[PDB]
Amino acid sequence: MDTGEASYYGSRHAGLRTASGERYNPNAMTAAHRTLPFGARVRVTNLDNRRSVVVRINDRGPFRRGRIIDVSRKAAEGLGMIRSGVAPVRIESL
């Protein structure tokens, strides 16, 4: 398990290529991580509300120290983080 800040992608990225080759899709359950293999499944828990989702890694970044994962819009909805923008999260590779 690891911990850090989560963010979510803006829609300005929708349709643009991720590092995995997939075009970023706000409706997918995808995320960026610096090192996990593409396709890795990760349980993300928002430590502010205890909501959790499972995402699939398809991109690189994040781009700031202290930020551990960037998730899709749909994942952010599942995490209850749309209004907060960011949240402290636990992550666990599955």
Add this chain to the structure above:
Amino acid sequence: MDTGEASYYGSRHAGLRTASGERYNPNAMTAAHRTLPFGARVRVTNLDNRRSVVVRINDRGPFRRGRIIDVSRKAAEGLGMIRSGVAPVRIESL
């Protein structure tokens, strides 16, 4: 005044430098535009729901064909466009 398609920055970009030099802050009321001066204040109206907000220009882009402005996360929330991703907008210089 002009009309065109808008998208938004989320929080993935938070902390990264804009073309104006300031770090992008998803909680600020800001936007990227190709031509308006940095510091320009504009009213952005979502033409689908008629919501409006005021933002200041602090970045350059979108460098996507078929988009006229990319607003901050907080602005997108105010415009009701988080889920839609894109929205038709009018921009009016103040």
